[PDB]
Amino acid sequence: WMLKLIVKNGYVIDPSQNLEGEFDILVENGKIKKIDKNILVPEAEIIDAKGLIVCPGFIDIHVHLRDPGQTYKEDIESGSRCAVAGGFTTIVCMPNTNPPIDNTTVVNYILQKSKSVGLCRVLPTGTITKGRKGKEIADFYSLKEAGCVAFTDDGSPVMDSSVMRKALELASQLGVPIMDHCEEAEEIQIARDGILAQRTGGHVHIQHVSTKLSLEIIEFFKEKGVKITCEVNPNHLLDRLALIEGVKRGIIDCFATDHAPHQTFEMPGIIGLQTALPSALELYRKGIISLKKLIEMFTINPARIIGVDLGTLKLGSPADITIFDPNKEWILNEETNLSKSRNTPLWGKVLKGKVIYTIKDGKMVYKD
Ligand SMILES: [Zn+2]
């Protein structure tokens, strides 16, 4: 027990604050006390981050932890392990559990398991409808009391478009976002949500986008000031061409893995938490985005979507810090796979860029 951590000698990047440079970080009592050149204080753990990139803990707003219900595919513990090894200090879990996250009991189980694992923050989402069934609007006042940070029906989508409408109405008084899509229909669903979003004032977040029209559609509503955001999974990216384009223009707000543990295979998609970064770094290596923007899409933008004050290194914030070497080579296989599943096309490829430390509330929760 010392209360004090110094991360010396790394390149700090904090897009939230426009901060970039060779700084040291003083961490004190869970929280960030100082950023400055050349720091030394008695009574502190030093971490030599020379050569490495130091930035806010990544946040991922789209993960399937499969818990309860399908914990052979994955569960809160192995999911949290994946997460911290991939530089994530907060993951948002989706409600297509069994039983589904539609009552406080399940919320409360998920928070409890979470505190016991100890590794990263898990924030619950609630379903939009009771039992995700499609008919009745769920109890938002109480699920948000209990700790839910978004509502979604993940893998049934509200076709009944006046349900979706009530969802956005209530979402907007409670100040939480509605998430949609997963599994010309895509474009029509996105335009419906945008239209419905502007009328209601509610924030809609689009979870899958696959075509140039959809991006243009979202981009249209965004310039009209509609509160509509979207994500792309960076393991996807290797018109798939226009997705790369929309990351460029800044139309896609954040990366989110849509970590999707499967045991049989033969939409369904793929595990992702441990490979997101080397993935996203490929775009940086081919010059599609800078390092600032790539960190932006893992930190502050996702933070802003689910409205939590994370993803910064503001003096005060919780010391949620990721430290990575963008140049280190490693291979996802049995040796290094921390997921209970195995389902990603990246298995056995050489990936480039590995997280070296993950710090949450000032405690080390992962070390290489
Ligand atoms: Zn999903």
Coordinates of C-alpha atoms and ligand atoms in Angstrom, one line a residue:
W1 CA 0.0 0.0 0.0
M2 CA 1.2 3.3 -1.3
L3 CA -1.5 5.8 -2.5
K4 CA 0.8 7.2 -5.3
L5 CA 1.7 6.0 -8.8
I6 CA 3.9 7.9 -11.3
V7 CA 3.8 6.9 -15.0
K8 CA 7.1 8.3 -16.3
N9 CA 8.6 8.8 -19.8
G10 CA 5.8 8.0 -22.2
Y11 CA 4.0 10.0 -24.9
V12 CA 0.7 11.1 -23.3
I13 CA -2.2 11.7 -25.6
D14 CA -5.5 13.0 -24.3
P15 CA -7.8 14.2 -27.1
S16 CA -10.5 15.3 -24.7
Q17 CA -8.1 18.0 -23.4
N18 CA -6.1 18.7 -26.6
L19 CA -3.1 17.2 -24.7
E20 CA -0.2 15.5 -26.5
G21 CA 3.5 15.3 -25.5
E22 CA 6.2 13.8 -23.3
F23 CA 4.6 14.1 -20.0
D24 CA 4.5 12.2 -16.7
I25 CA 1.3 11.5 -14.8
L26 CA 0.9 11.6 -11.0
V27 CA -1.8 9.3 -9.8
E28 CA -3.0 9.7 -6.2
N29 CA -5.9 8.1 -4.2
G30 CA -7.6 6.5 -7.3
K31 CA -7.5 9.8 -9.1
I32 CA -5.3 11.9 -11.4
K33 CA -3.5 14.5 -9.4
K34 CA -1.0 16.0 -12.0
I35 CA 0.4 15.9 -15.6
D36 CA 3.8 17.6 -16.0
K37 CA 7.3 17.1 -17.3
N38 CA 9.8 15.4 -15.1
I39 CA 7.7 14.4 -12.0
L40 CA 9.2 12.8 -8.8
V41 CA 7.5 12.5 -5.3
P42 CA 8.4 10.3 -2.4
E43 CA 6.4 7.2 -1.6
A44 CA 5.2 6.1 -5.1
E45 CA 5.3 3.2 -7.5
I46 CA 7.0 4.3 -10.7
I47 CA 6.0 2.8 -14.1
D48 CA 8.6 3.4 -16.9
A49 CA 6.4 4.0 -20.0
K50 CA 9.4 5.0 -22.1
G51 CA 8.7 4.3 -25.7
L52 CA 5.0 3.6 -25.1
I53 CA 1.7 5.6 -25.6
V54 CA -0.2 6.6 -22.5
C55 CA -3.9 7.6 -22.8
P56 CA -7.3 7.3 -21.1
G57 CA -8.7 3.8 -20.5
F58 CA -10.6 2.6 -23.6
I59 CA -14.4 2.3 -23.4
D60 CA -16.3 -0.2 -25.5
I61 CA -20.1 0.3 -25.7
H62 CA -20.9 -3.0 -27.5
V63 CA -20.0 -6.3 -25.9
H64 CA -22.0 -9.5 -25.4
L65 CA -20.8 -11.1 -22.0
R66 CA -23.4 -13.9 -22.3
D67 CA -23.9 -13.8 -18.6
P68 CA -26.1 -15.0 -17.2
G69 CA -27.4 -17.8 -19.4
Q70 CA -24.7 -18.8 -21.8
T71 CA -21.6 -18.6 -19.6
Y72 CA -19.9 -21.5 -21.6
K73 CA -19.5 -19.0 -24.5
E74 CA -18.2 -16.3 -22.1
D75 CA -19.0 -14.7 -18.8
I76 CA -18.4 -11.5 -16.7
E77 CA -14.9 -12.8 -15.6
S78 CA -13.4 -14.0 -18.9
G79 CA -15.0 -11.0 -20.6
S80 CA -13.5 -8.6 -18.2
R81 CA -10.1 -10.4 -18.6
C82 CA -10.4 -9.9 -22.4
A83 CA -11.3 -6.4 -21.9
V84 CA -8.4 -5.2 -19.7
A85 CA -5.9 -7.2 -21.9
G86 CA -7.2 -5.2 -24.8
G87 CA -6.8 -1.9 -23.0
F88 CA -10.5 -1.5 -22.0
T89 CA -11.3 -0.1 -18.4
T90 CA -15.0 0.2 -19.2
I91 CA -17.2 -2.2 -21.3
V92 CA -21.0 -1.8 -21.8
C93 CA -22.8 -5.1 -21.8
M94 CA -25.9 -5.8 -24.0
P95 CA -29.2 -7.2 -22.5
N96 CA -29.8 -10.3 -24.7
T97 CA -28.8 -12.4 -21.7
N98 CA -31.1 -15.1 -20.3
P99 CA -32.9 -14.0 -18.4
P100 CA -32.8 -10.7 -20.3
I101 CA -31.7 -7.4 -18.5
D102 CA -35.3 -6.2 -18.1
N103 CA -35.7 -6.0 -14.3
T104 CA -33.5 -4.7 -11.4
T105 CA -32.7 -8.2 -10.3
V106 CA -30.6 -8.9 -13.4
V107 CA -29.0 -5.4 -13.4
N108 CA -28.1 -6.0 -9.8
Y109 CA -26.6 -9.4 -10.4
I110 CA -24.4 -8.0 -13.2
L111 CA -23.1 -5.1 -11.0
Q112 CA -22.4 -7.5 -8.2
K113 CA -20.5 -10.1 -10.2
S114 CA -18.6 -7.1 -11.8
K115 CA -17.3 -5.6 -8.4
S116 CA -16.2 -9.2 -7.4
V117 CA -14.1 -9.7 -10.7
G118 CA -12.3 -6.5 -10.0
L119 CA -10.9 -5.8 -13.4
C120 CA -12.9 -3.3 -15.5
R121 CA -16.1 -1.3 -15.0
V122 CA -19.2 -3.1 -16.4
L123 CA -22.2 -0.8 -17.1
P124 CA -25.6 -2.5 -17.7
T125 CA -28.0 -1.7 -20.5
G126 CA -31.7 -2.5 -20.3
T127 CA -34.0 -4.0 -23.0
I128 CA -36.5 -1.7 -24.7
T129 CA -39.5 -4.1 -24.2
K130 CA -40.3 -6.6 -21.5
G131 CA -38.4 -9.8 -22.3
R132 CA -37.2 -8.1 -25.5
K133 CA -40.5 -9.6 -26.8
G134 CA -41.6 -6.7 -28.9
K135 CA -44.9 -5.5 -27.4
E136 CA -44.7 -3.5 -24.1
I137 CA -42.3 -0.7 -23.1
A138 CA -40.1 -1.8 -20.2
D139 CA -39.5 0.1 -16.9
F140 CA -36.9 2.8 -17.8
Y141 CA -37.2 4.8 -14.6
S142 CA -36.2 1.8 -12.5
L143 CA -33.6 0.1 -14.7
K144 CA -31.8 3.6 -14.9
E145 CA -32.1 3.9 -11.1
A146 CA -30.5 0.4 -10.8
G147 CA -27.6 1.5 -13.1
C148 CA -28.5 0.9 -16.8
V149 CA -26.9 3.4 -19.2
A150 CA -28.8 2.7 -22.4
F151 CA -31.7 0.7 -23.7
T152 CA -31.7 -1.6 -26.7
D153 CA -33.5 -4.7 -28.0
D154 CA -30.3 -6.1 -29.6
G155 CA -31.3 -9.0 -32.0
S156 CA -35.1 -8.6 -32.4
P157 CA -35.2 -4.8 -33.4
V158 CA -38.3 -2.7 -32.7
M159 CA -40.1 -3.2 -36.0
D160 CA -43.3 -1.8 -34.4
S161 CA -42.1 1.7 -35.1
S162 CA -44.4 3.4 -32.6
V163 CA -42.8 1.3 -29.8
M164 CA -39.5 2.7 -31.0
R165 CA -41.2 6.1 -30.8
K166 CA -42.2 5.7 -27.2
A167 CA -38.7 4.4 -26.4
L168 CA -37.2 7.7 -27.7
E169 CA -39.7 9.8 -25.8
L170 CA -38.9 8.3 -22.5
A171 CA -35.1 8.0 -23.3
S172 CA -35.2 11.8 -23.8
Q173 CA -36.6 12.8 -20.4
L174 CA -34.3 10.3 -18.7
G175 CA -31.3 11.6 -20.7
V176 CA -30.1 8.2 -21.9
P177 CA -29.6 6.9 -25.5
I178 CA -31.5 4.2 -27.4
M179 CA -29.4 1.7 -29.3
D180 CA -30.7 0.0 -32.4
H181 CA -29.7 -2.6 -35.1
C182 CA -27.6 -5.8 -34.8
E183 CA -29.1 -9.2 -35.8
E184 CA -32.6 -1.4 -48.3
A185 CA -34.0 -2.4 -44.9
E186 CA -30.9 -0.9 -43.1
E187 CA -31.2 2.5 -44.8
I188 CA -35.0 2.6 -44.1
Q189 CA -34.5 1.7 -40.4
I190 CA -31.8 4.3 -40.0
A191 CA -34.0 7.0 -41.6
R192 CA -36.9 6.0 -39.4
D193 CA -34.7 6.3 -36.3
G194 CA -33.4 9.7 -37.4
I195 CA -36.8 11.0 -38.3
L196 CA -38.2 9.6 -35.0
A197 CA -35.1 11.0 -33.1
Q198 CA -35.6 14.6 -34.3
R199 CA -39.3 14.6 -33.3
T200 CA -38.8 13.2 -29.9
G201 CA -35.5 15.0 -29.0
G202 CA -34.2 11.5 -28.0
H203 CA -30.6 10.3 -28.8
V204 CA -30.5 7.2 -31.1
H205 CA -27.3 5.3 -31.5
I206 CA -26.9 3.1 -34.6
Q207 CA -25.1 -0.1 -34.0
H208 CA -24.6 -1.4 -37.5
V209 CA -23.8 0.5 -40.7
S210 CA -22.8 -1.2 -43.9
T211 CA -23.4 1.1 -46.9
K212 CA -22.5 4.5 -48.2
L213 CA -26.2 5.6 -48.3
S214 CA -26.6 4.9 -44.5
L215 CA -23.6 6.9 -43.7
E216 CA -24.9 9.9 -45.8
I217 CA -28.3 9.5 -44.1
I218 CA -26.7 9.7 -40.6
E219 CA -24.4 12.5 -41.8
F220 CA -27.5 14.4 -43.1
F221 CA -29.4 14.2 -39.7
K222 CA -26.2 15.1 -37.9
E223 CA -25.9 18.5 -39.7
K224 CA -29.6 19.1 -39.0
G225 CA -28.6 18.7 -35.3
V226 CA -30.4 15.3 -34.7
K227 CA -28.8 13.4 -31.8
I228 CA -27.8 10.4 -33.7
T229 CA -24.4 8.6 -33.3
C230 CA -23.0 5.4 -34.8
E231 CA -20.2 2.9 -34.4
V232 CA -18.1 0.6 -36.4
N233 CA -16.2 -2.5 -35.2
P234 CA -12.5 -2.0 -36.1
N235 CA -11.8 -5.8 -36.4
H236 CA -14.2 -5.6 -39.4
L237 CA -12.1 -3.4 -41.5
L238 CA -9.5 -6.1 -41.9
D239 CA -19.4 -0.3 -49.5
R240 CA -16.8 -1.5 -46.8
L241 CA -14.8 1.1 -48.7
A242 CA -17.2 3.9 -47.6
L243 CA -17.0 2.8 -44.0
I244 CA -13.2 3.5 -44.1
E245 CA -14.3 6.8 -45.8
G246 CA -16.8 7.7 -43.0
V247 CA -14.1 7.1 -40.3
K248 CA -12.1 9.7 -42.3
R249 CA -14.8 12.4 -42.5
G250 CA -15.6 11.8 -38.8
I251 CA -19.2 10.5 -39.5
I252 CA -18.6 7.3 -37.4
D253 CA -18.5 8.4 -33.8
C254 CA -16.5 5.6 -32.1
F255 CA -15.1 2.0 -32.3
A256 CA -17.0 -0.7 -30.7
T257 CA -16.2 -4.3 -31.1
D258 CA -19.6 -5.9 -30.8
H259 CA -17.7 -8.7 -29.0
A260 CA -19.8 -11.7 -29.9
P261 CA -18.7 -15.1 -28.3
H262 CA -20.0 -18.1 -30.3
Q263 CA -19.3 -21.8 -29.9
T264 CA -21.0 -23.2 -33.0
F265 CA -20.6 -20.9 -36.1
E266 CA -22.0 -23.0 -39.1
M267 CA -24.2 -12.3 -38.3
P268 CA -23.3 -14.1 -36.2
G269 CA -20.1 -12.0 -35.8
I270 CA -16.9 -12.2 -33.8
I271 CA -14.9 -11.8 -30.6
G272 CA -13.0 -8.5 -30.6
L273 CA -12.0 -7.1 -27.2
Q274 CA -8.4 -8.3 -27.3
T275 CA -7.7 -7.4 -31.0
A276 CA -9.6 -4.0 -31.3
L277 CA -6.4 -2.0 -30.9
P278 CA -4.0 -3.7 -33.3
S279 CA -7.0 -3.5 -35.6
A280 CA -7.7 0.2 -35.3
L281 CA -3.9 0.7 -35.6
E282 CA -3.9 -0.7 -39.1
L283 CA -5.9 2.4 -40.2
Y284 CA -3.4 4.6 -38.6
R285 CA -0.4 2.8 -40.3
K286 CA -2.0 3.4 -43.7
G287 CA -2.6 7.1 -42.7
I288 CA -6.5 6.9 -42.8
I289 CA -6.6 8.5 -39.3
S290 CA -4.1 10.0 -36.9
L291 CA -3.3 8.6 -33.4
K292 CA -5.3 11.4 -31.7
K293 CA -8.5 10.5 -33.7
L294 CA -8.0 6.7 -33.1
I295 CA -7.6 7.3 -29.4
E296 CA -10.5 9.7 -29.6
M297 CA -12.8 6.9 -31.0
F298 CA -11.8 4.6 -28.1
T299 CA -12.1 7.2 -25.3
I300 CA -14.0 10.5 -25.3
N301 CA -16.6 9.9 -28.0
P302 CA -17.9 6.6 -26.6
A303 CA -17.9 8.3 -23.2
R304 CA -20.0 11.1 -24.6
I305 CA -22.5 8.7 -26.1
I306 CA -23.5 6.9 -22.9
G307 CA -23.0 10.2 -21.0
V308 CA -20.3 9.1 -18.5
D309 CA -17.4 11.3 -17.4
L310 CA -14.7 8.8 -18.4
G311 CA -12.2 8.7 -21.3
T312 CA -10.1 11.8 -20.2
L313 CA -7.0 12.4 -18.1
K314 CA -8.5 15.6 -16.6
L315 CA -7.0 16.4 -13.3
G316 CA -9.6 14.8 -11.0
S317 CA -10.9 12.0 -13.2
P318 CA -10.5 8.4 -12.1
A319 CA -7.0 7.1 -13.0
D320 CA -8.3 4.9 -15.8
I321 CA -5.1 4.7 -17.9
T322 CA -4.2 2.4 -20.9
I323 CA -0.5 2.1 -22.0
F324 CA 0.3 0.5 -25.3
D325 CA 3.2 -0.1 -27.6
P326 CA 1.8 0.4 -31.1
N327 CA 4.8 -1.5 -32.7
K328 CA 4.9 -4.8 -30.8
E329 CA 4.1 -8.0 -32.6
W330 CA 2.0 -10.8 -31.1
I331 CA -0.4 -13.6 -32.1
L332 CA -3.9 -14.3 -30.8
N333 CA -4.0 -18.1 -30.1
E334 CA -4.6 -20.5 -27.2
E335 CA -1.4 -19.2 -25.6
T336 CA -2.8 -15.6 -25.4
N337 CA -6.6 -16.0 -26.0
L338 CA -8.4 -14.9 -22.8
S339 CA -11.9 -15.4 -24.2
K340 CA -13.6 -18.7 -23.6
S341 CA -14.4 -18.7 -27.4
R342 CA -12.2 -18.7 -30.5
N343 CA -14.4 -17.0 -33.1
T344 CA -12.5 -14.3 -35.1
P345 CA -10.9 -14.4 -38.6
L346 CA -7.9 -12.8 -37.0
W347 CA -6.9 -16.1 -35.2
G348 CA -3.2 -16.9 -35.7
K349 CA -2.5 -13.8 -37.8
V350 CA 0.4 -11.5 -36.7
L351 CA -1.2 -8.4 -35.1
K352 CA 0.7 -5.2 -34.5
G353 CA 0.2 -3.1 -31.4
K354 CA -0.2 -4.6 -27.9
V355 CA -1.5 -3.1 -24.7
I356 CA 1.3 -3.2 -22.0
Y357 CA -0.5 -2.0 -18.9
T358 CA -4.1 -1.3 -18.0
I359 CA -4.8 0.8 -15.0
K360 CA -8.3 1.2 -13.5
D361 CA -8.9 3.4 -10.4
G362 CA -5.2 3.7 -10.1
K363 CA -4.7 0.0 -9.5
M364 CA -2.9 -2.2 -12.2
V365 CA -5.4 -4.6 -13.5
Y366 CA -3.4 -5.9 -16.4
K367 CA 0.3 -6.2 -17.1
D368 CA 2.0 -7.8 -20.1
Ligands
ZN1 ZN -24.7 -6.8 -30.5

